Write a protein that binds this ligand. Sequence first.
Ligand SMILES: CCCCCCCCCCCCCCCCC[C@@H](O)O[C@H](CO[C@H](O)CCCCCCCCCCCCCCC)COP(=O)(O)OCC[N+](C)(C)C
Ligand SMILES: CCCCCCCCCCCCCCCCC[C@@H](O)O[C@H](CO[C@H](O)CCCCCCCCCCCCCCC)COP(=O)(O)OCC[N+](C)(C)C
Ligand SMILES: CCCCCCCC/C=C/CCCCCCCC(=O)OC[C@H](COP(=O)(O)OCCN)OC(=O)CCCCCCC/C=C/CCCCCCCC
Ligand SMILES: CCCCCCCCCCCC(=O)SCCNC(=O)CCNC(=O)[C@H](O)C(C)(C)COP(=O)(O)O
Lengths: 178, 56, 53, 88, 175, 459, 70
Amino acid sequence: AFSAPAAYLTHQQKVLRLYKRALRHLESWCVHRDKYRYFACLMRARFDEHKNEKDMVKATQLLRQAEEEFWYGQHPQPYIFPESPGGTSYERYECYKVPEWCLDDWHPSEKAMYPDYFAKREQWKRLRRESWEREVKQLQEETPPGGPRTEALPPARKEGDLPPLWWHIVTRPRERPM
Amino acid sequence: NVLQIVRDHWVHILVPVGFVFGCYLDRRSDEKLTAFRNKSLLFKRELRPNEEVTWK
Amino acid sequence: GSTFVAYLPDYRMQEWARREAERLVKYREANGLPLMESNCFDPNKIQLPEDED
Amino acid sequence: SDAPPLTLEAIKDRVLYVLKLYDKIDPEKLSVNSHFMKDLGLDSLDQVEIIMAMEDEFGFEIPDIDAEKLMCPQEIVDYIADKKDVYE
Amino acid sequence: PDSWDKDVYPEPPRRTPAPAPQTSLPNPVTYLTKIFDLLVDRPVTLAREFIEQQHAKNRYYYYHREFRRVPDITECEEKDILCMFEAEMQWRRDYKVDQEIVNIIQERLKACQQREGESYRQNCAKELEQFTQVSKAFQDRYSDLGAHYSARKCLAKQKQRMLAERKAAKEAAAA
Amino acid sequence: MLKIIIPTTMLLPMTWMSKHNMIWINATVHSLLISLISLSLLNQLGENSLNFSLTFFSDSLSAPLLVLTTWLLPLMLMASQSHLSKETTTRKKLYITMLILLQLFLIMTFTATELILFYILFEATLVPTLIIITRWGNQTERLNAGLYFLFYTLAGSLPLLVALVYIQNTTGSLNFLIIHYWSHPLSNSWSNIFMWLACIMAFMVKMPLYGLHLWLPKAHVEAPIAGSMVLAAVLLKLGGYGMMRITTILNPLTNYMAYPFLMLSMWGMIMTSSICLRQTDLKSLIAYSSVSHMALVIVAIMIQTPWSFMGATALMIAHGLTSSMLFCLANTNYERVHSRTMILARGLQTLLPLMATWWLVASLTNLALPPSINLIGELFIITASFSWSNITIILMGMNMMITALYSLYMLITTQRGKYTHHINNIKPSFTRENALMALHILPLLLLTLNPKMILGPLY
Amino acid sequence: HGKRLFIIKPSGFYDRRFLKLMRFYILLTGIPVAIGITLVNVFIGEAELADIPEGYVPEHWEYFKHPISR
Ligand SMILES: CCCCCCCCCCCCCCCCC[C@@H](O)O[C@H](CO[C@H](O)CCCCCCCCCCCCCCC)COP(=O)(O)OCC[N+](C)(C)C
Ligand SMILES: CCCCCCCCCCCCCCCCC[C@@H](O)O[C@H](CO[C@H](O)CCCCCCCCCCCCCCC)COP(=O)(O)OCC[N+](C)(C)C
Ligand SMILES: CCCCCCCC/C=C/CCCCCCCC(=O)OC[C@H](COP(=O)(O)OCCN)OC(=O)CCCCCCC/C=C/CCCCCCCC
Ligand SMILES: CCCCCCCCCCCC(=O)SCCNC(=O)CCNC(=O)[C@H](O)C(C)(C)COP(=O)(O)O
């Protein structure tokens, strides 16, 4: 989720993803641990048989054919972690995620409470104002001509520099704000 | 301060003056529809010892 | 305004109608009359046109 | 909830625990910064099985794109700390 | 209570059985209702007495309005607007009175259905027939007039019904 | 009746002689006082009417509409106070003058003992609305919307004047009282058919009827907040009032005549409620919901039974208040976002909780939740239609379901979910806006305690 | 444990202020009205139906029961 995506998925990426999906769905099928371990090792062994195959056409024939088998026995109700995109608590706490700039709209009587927090916030705002002005030039000079080719950002290269476009990545609300 | 706040707050008096004027005009227009006063079949009534009109 | 609307006098005559109906039914039951009549107006004062067809 | 506020020490301890119960690695040779491909001679399938164990240990599953480019216990701990917003 | 007439809304004598304790165990209902009386009914009763003596210290009366009888729409000329106005007002008042009469009969029916409980199908035949009769009468007078109803429309409906009745009677006699 | 009219006229010199920074304060206070004065008219009789004079009378159909018309002006002033801040004093005074003139025309329209006076004022209300729409409008299509609104109305109403003058030439009077007492049946003739059409289509266009409803989305979307409020709350009810007043002469021709309209409205409520489901605009969605409600009111008036009339009156009042509240909420969102599209600003409940509560209450009262007067009118009209025909309920059923859907849809798209990350100019809701919503919503929940006060003359 | 973290939330000052103002004004007018209604009901109210004396005609406001209505 954090890393930028690639222009495509290689054959080894596809086989690894298929291995991951198949092993997760077999764990969903095999509730008990010993049965799952035995069948997972049997599946791993079966998987490793075609490991040294060099024919690309044959390589294409492998896995895609397996994918059809995976689709046939894909356990229509697989196990999903609670916070995963299919879990029962996927977006439970998105309603508690309040943006940071909202604090700029607080009444002064409210800002009277928590003064140290707002002082540190002012220091953060100063740092952002300087760093963004540096980052604009840094990204303008480092970006390839004709526009970027991959949505990955370069790190900071000087001493006082900060990572470009950092304000909204560092200032995430929290995973569980309340 | 009187004679100073008046020049700025004189406008407020207008709506109530319009209301009392409208009430007076309503009564005056009412005064012209008395042709059937104390003459309706449902309310023929004999006047009181010190009464001149049933309603004004 | 809500208080004024709540305590508006009975110009719709609902309690008046209830008392009128109460007195009327009290009288009708005693006389043995059959409650409310089918005809809204007395037929003796209605002059139908004779058909002769 | 009543969940203790887990820290970096606890995360790293549990990571190394899971890795030492991985019998394909002898415990006395691994380290915090030890690589998976070269320092331990593990297959890519072994790495994704390590990812399986991590996901089943911490109760959350890592996306495949991030998982496939995790080769050290230290960077795995750093990633999971970033996900869980760990202070110290 | 004297607030309402007993003949208009009749009620049975309301015979009630006597307590027959077949066991020596003290039932909770009697003690519970006694403590309820002591803690609730007495303070409410004294508050009511205070309010009643406060009311008696100031006394005033209001009188039910009485209306004269006015010639109806049948004693009105075809274009004479004053008598038609008076007749329309009288007809509307009579319509309101009939609505209240039907309301009273429906109240009687509902009270019977609740009071006689499980044997409501037999012990409320009198009220059912009473409501059937009054509903038949009321429906004949005003059912199809609709919105913008008037005394003239009601009179026309009555005339149509009575010509139909007269034709039916003549045909039956001459059958 | 002049005790209400004269203060409304005096509102103009008071506004124009006001200090440059005291117009809003003076206008709101005196408008609220005039509204309080209007409350006296509510105490109606079961007898004929409140005939004040030869020119004006009151009725329990006219009294709730008059009270609502008077109450709407302070709300419109408070809503307009925001976006007219950077505006010269003369033009703000002109805006207030136009609002006052609109109120005066509506007040004289609703009493109107005579039909030609009613028509004159009914069409006099058109000019201030047109000027408000085409002058203080944001987009470039306000001119086209004003043209549509003017010409639909005039095309509908020009035959009405000819029909009225013909009716006076034949009968001899256009007075409401005389017409009611001297009503005579209309023979089923081609000339009578066209007279019926001329008498009905003018009020049908302003409801508006499903076939003729195009002007309304344009006029509502392009008008300012005060214009939208006055269009949705009062101006749509003029057609219903006119139909209820003029239908007496029409019988017995209405039964045969009513079928094209009954079918158009019963299918158009479904069509517009379904259109509401796929909309990218708040204002258009509210406009189509208004069209559906007024189609139901058309059905109620055309059935022409007592329960139909009571339901139509209650539904008109409830819809006026609810639609004004909905437009106010949409305008509060727009003044922050400047986009007026639902899908852009999302998750506003997290940022504005009290405003989200107001949204919930408005959507619930638009949904016709009992025992609100919205459902009172809904149920009375539905029962009358069922007595008219046992099949109508099916259509009505669909309508209810669809209504609820889009209502909650509008509640879910803008208030629930995740707030858009980029928008950062969402400031806390002002006291003025919260007061506006409270003053919109409290009368509904007060009126549900006394429904007979808005059930019309056939109660 | 001293792990008290800061809770970022929108400013509720204005909503609370509006609610307090609305309650204050509504009560400011309703409490006197409620007190007056209670005093009228307890002390003066609840007239009881009578018969019109012969030769006397009542005034228009004497046909109502509640004193406030009269
Ligand atoms: C914040 C959380 C809650 C705190 C508050 C708790 C207290 C809750 C109590 C509030 C409501 C709960 C229900 C209690 C109801 C008791 C009062 C009720 O009985 O009075 C009603 C009275 O209410 C009024 O009838 C309705 C209000 C009037 C509405 C007019 C609107 C106000 C004008 C503003 C402009 C209009 C805009 C819209 C144009 C149409 C009904 O009276 P009614 O049974 O009949 O007879 C009264 C006695 N008589 C016989 C002597 C006459
Ligand atoms: C576009 C969005 C909606 C706009 C509004 C639409 C609503 C207005 C439509 C008007 C409804 C019908 C008008 C006339 C209805 C009369 C009844 C007729 O349809 O039934 C038969 C009539 O037969 C035929 O219909 C004759 C008329 C045929 C010519 C009419 C054109 C038909 C389609 C045109 C529709 C276009 C409307 C819009 C124009 C711009 C009955 O036969 P008959 O017993 O002999 O006549 C009885 C009437 N009498 C007693 C007066 C003699
Ligand atoms: C969409 C609205 C519905 C339109 C339905 C029909 C559209 C097609 C009609 C186009 C216009 C036709 C113009 C000529 C119509 C002639 C009708 C007529 O003359 O009847 C007048 C009739 C009797 O005539 P006399 O000679 O005086 O009687 C003596 C012998 N009995 O008297 C009247 O009732 C006068 C009333 C004026 C009739 C109205 C004419 C216009 C059409 C009716 C309105 C319908 C269109 C409304 C437009 C909708 C836009 C929102
Ligand atoms: C319960 C649901 C049922 C699911 C059905 C699943 C079907 C399983 C059977 C599929 C058979 C196959 O192996 S699919 C055959 C696909 N072709 C190849 O595997 C050729 C070269 N292999 C690679 O390149 C890999 O990456 C590898 C070397 C293994 C590791 O790589 P690392 O060194 O970079 O970790």
